Nucleic acid binder design. Structure first.
Ligand SMILES: [Mg+2]
Ligand SMILES: [Mg+2]
Ligand SMILES: [Mg+2]
Ligand SMILES: [Mg+2]
Ligand SMILES: [Mg+2]
Ligand SMILES: [Mg+2]
Ligand SMILES: [Mg+2]
Ligand SMILES: [Mg+2]
Lengths: 63, 225, 52, 240
RNA sequence: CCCCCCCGGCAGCAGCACUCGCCGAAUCCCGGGGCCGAGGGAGCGAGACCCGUCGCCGCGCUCUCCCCCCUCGGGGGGGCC
RNA sequence: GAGGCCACGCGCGCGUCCCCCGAAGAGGGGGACGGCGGAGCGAGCGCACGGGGUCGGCGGCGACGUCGGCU
RNA sequence: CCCCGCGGACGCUACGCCGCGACGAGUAGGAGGGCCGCUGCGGUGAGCCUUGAAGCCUAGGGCGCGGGCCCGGGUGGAGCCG
């Protein structure tokens, strides 16, 4: 037996969009490839934002 | 451009091979120098004791600066302070071993977890056996076996430790980067002591196994791994 | 396992080969010296017992 | 090219040479042997013959496969060892020296005492407890399944024939060419035949082993007897 | 028999006359029994084609020349400044 | 001056130290070390304690009686 | 400038495939997955079926950790399933 705690083992985060939008899934494929094969952290941020929900992607006003 | 690119790849491979050869020669000579240092220290202790006895005085050796700590009791019914100190020593399992740099703070922690551990002062042979047979690195939070020197070099080369011999030297003679070298090592997962223990529930000085046995930790290690 | 696998130990520490070779040569020399010294002691005993 | 030389680095322990890198450099004289600078036709042209068939034909060897299976198996990795049985080193127990009396533990010659002659290329022992004594011909046996006793005869300076090899003693079979389905019994030839060559070899070996057996008293009686376990005796307490 | 000698000498030496230790960078060699064999495209090279006998590591021989010791070209050694 | 070890082995020029004569203790002649200086390349066989097992080893037995099927 | 060879395994349902490391108790309770199961509806299988559907029986052969499922034999006689 090992003296560890298992309540925080599974990190709760989006690994994919919960949406079934096929266009969104295609561009998630594109940015998954770009984030994997480039060192640009911008691609990583964009991919994790694509995974997000609508409340986590609020609309941006023109102003 | 085919001949030119062949020349380019041959030159690159040859430069890489020469670099590997130079690094291997450096590793060999560092190990030789470490051997010289070890025998110098071992003979120096004997010589100092001899001159003190010739003069009729007493030579008190330096208090040991390295300890090996083995957790001997299990994980059931442990008080919170003992549990916390064992976690800070990285002994979360029975028959787990860890090298500890000895000072006031570490010794007081060892006193706190005294009933749960057996600790002592390992010798050069014990350090060699532990690192070579059961040495695993914490590389990218993974337990990776130390099967190549490149694994040590990629994680500790910024500190000058680039081989098994450098790691063993830093562990044995407690160097400047002992904390980094020791935390790089995964805690040793030792077997059950072959031949059994005396009594895990009492102290070593009262016929048991817990607490500080001075240099009998080497006997324990030989039976342990 | 190094300490059991010679080439694995040499991969991790190339100086182990020269240490091991020096140890083997030294042990052979010391064994020969002790054997010769014991044989000389036995021959001296034979001479001092059958010196006539 | 030059004549191959001996190793010049004597082995003192397996994997370790007696001399160091610089010592072997000086022994090899690498200081002056320094060097800086300086197929098979796949297709064959054949005259096809016949008028206006062109000149010749460029016929390739190893034509491409006619058929491909629906799926294959990936090739294995590489193991840097695992030599074939013919290249294995053959180990012999120190108690088995030429002329030792052995005890057979398995087979139809179970419990018989035979004479050891030599180890063969496969590590199998060649024995002949002489056929006039206990009906054991020149025959192979396995050193794992024998007991080496302490009694020995000096079978030095006797001539074991050179053709007595593993290929010589290998079993022979008849079945099964020109026959696929068994409606008529192919049980013929099942009577193994002792070859005249085998009889000649047996006579030649025994004619020079027997006088040395008769040289010591009642060893022939010992070889005629078979080994057995009496109810009082135990193999771990027995000196062989 | 015990102690001090004016002082010892020889051999051995934690003894292969089993009295009493701690050890191994001051440590190596060999052997036996048991359990196991997971993985499966490792080729920067020829532009591969018989199934990559491959990488790292440790070695040997040749692209130099003399000899030595056994076999009858083969095997085993000393090197060669 | 009648042994052991070295993971020491190309030249040229530069530096550092040592040696000789030193006719200003000038100037040349020699050794040792170098991490210094603009210029491409060793290949060819093997053995293997070398990124997890193979044999280019073998035997016996097989139809109305026996072989295998841990379910 | 490849060519005496015109040639060169598999892969990548990307909701897929592959690698490495650590870990595995569980009531009340929470969550995920279910190519677990029942009934009916929209699509789809140029699906199955009187040369035998459903159901049932079975010392028959198997698959899955499991929920369960497939196939053989019998009975049955008109519908059924992915
Ligand atoms: Mg567990
Ligand atoms: Mg839990
Ligand atoms: Mg308890
Ligand atoms: Mg036991
Ligand atoms: Mg208690
Ligand atoms: Mg001793
Ligand atoms: Mg396998
Ligand atoms: Mg659970």
């Amino acid at each position: 037996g090992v003296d560890i705690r298992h309540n925080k083992d599974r990190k709760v985060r989006r690994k994919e969009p919960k949406s079934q939008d096929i266009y969104l899934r295609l561009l998630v494929k594109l940015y998954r490839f770009l984030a994997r094969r480039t060192n640009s952290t911008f691609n990583q941020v964009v991919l994790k934002r694509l995974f997000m929900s609508r409340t986590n992607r609020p609309p941006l006003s023109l102003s | 451009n085919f001949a030119e690119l062949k020349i380019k790849r041959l030159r690159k491979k040859f430069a890489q091979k020469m670099l590997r050869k130079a690094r291997r020669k450096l590793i060999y000579e560092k190990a030789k120098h470490y051997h010289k240092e070890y025998r110098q220290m071992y003979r120096t202790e004997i010589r100092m004791a001899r001159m003190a006895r010739k003069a009729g005085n007493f030579y008190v050796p330096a208090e040991p600066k390295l300890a090996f700590v083995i957790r001997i009791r299990g994980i059931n019914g442990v008080s919170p302070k003992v549990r916390k100190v064992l976690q800070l020593l990285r002994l979360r399992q029975i028959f787990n071993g860890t090298f500890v740099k000895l000072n006031k703070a570490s010794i007081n922690m060892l006193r706190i977890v005294e009933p749960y551990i057996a600790w002592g002062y390992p010798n050069l042979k014990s350090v060699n056996e532990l690192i070579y047979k059961r040495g695993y690195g914490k590389i990218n939070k993974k337990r990776i076996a130390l099967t190549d020197n490149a694994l040590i070099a990629r994680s500790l080369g910024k500190y000058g430790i680039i081989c098994m011999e450098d790691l063993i030297h830093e562990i044995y003679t407690v160097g400047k980067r002992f904390k980094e070298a020791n935390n790089f090592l995964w805690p040793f997962k030792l077997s059950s002591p072959r031949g059994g223990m005396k009594k895990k529930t009492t102290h070593f000085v009262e016929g048991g196994d817990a607490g500080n046995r001075e240099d009998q930790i080497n006997r324990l290690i030989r039976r342990m791994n | 396992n190094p300490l059991k696998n010679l080439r694995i130990m040499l991969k991790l520490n190339p100086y182990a080969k020269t240490m091991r070779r020096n140890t083997i040569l030294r042990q052979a020399r010391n064994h020969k010296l002790r054997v010769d010294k014991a044989a000389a002691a036995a021959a001296a005993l034979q001479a001092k017992s059958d010196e006539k | 090219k030059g004549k191959p030389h001996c190793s010049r680095n004597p082995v003192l322990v397996r994997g370790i040479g007696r001399y160091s890198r610089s010592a072997m450099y000086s022994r090899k004289a690498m200081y002056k042997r320094k060097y800086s600078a300086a197929k098979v036709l796949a297709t064959v042209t054949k005259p096809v013959g016949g008028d206006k068939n062109g000149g010749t034909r460029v016929v390739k060897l190893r034509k491409m496969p006619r058929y491909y299976p629906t799926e294959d198996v990936p090739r294995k990795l590489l193991s840097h060892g695992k030599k074939p049985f013919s290249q294995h080193v053959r180990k012999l127990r120190a108690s088995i020296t030429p002329g030792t009396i052995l005890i057979i533990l398995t087979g139809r010659h179970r419990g018989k005492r035979v004479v050891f002659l030599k180890q063969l290329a496969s590590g199998l022992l060649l024995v002949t407890g002489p056929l006039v004594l206990n009906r054991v011909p020149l025959r192979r046996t396995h050193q794992k399944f024998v007991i080496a006793t302490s009694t020995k005869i000096d079978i030095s300076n006797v001539k074991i024939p050179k053709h007595l090899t593993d290929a010589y003693f290998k079993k022979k079979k008849l079945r099964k060419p020109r026959h696929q389905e068994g409606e008529i019994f192919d049980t013929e030839k099942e009577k193994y035949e002792i070859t005249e060559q085998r009889k000649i070899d047996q006579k030649a070996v025994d004619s020079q082993i027997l006088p040395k057996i008769k040289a010591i008293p009642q060893l022939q009686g010992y070889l005629r007897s078979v080994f057995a376990l009496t109810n009082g005796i135990y193999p771990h307490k027995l000196v062989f």
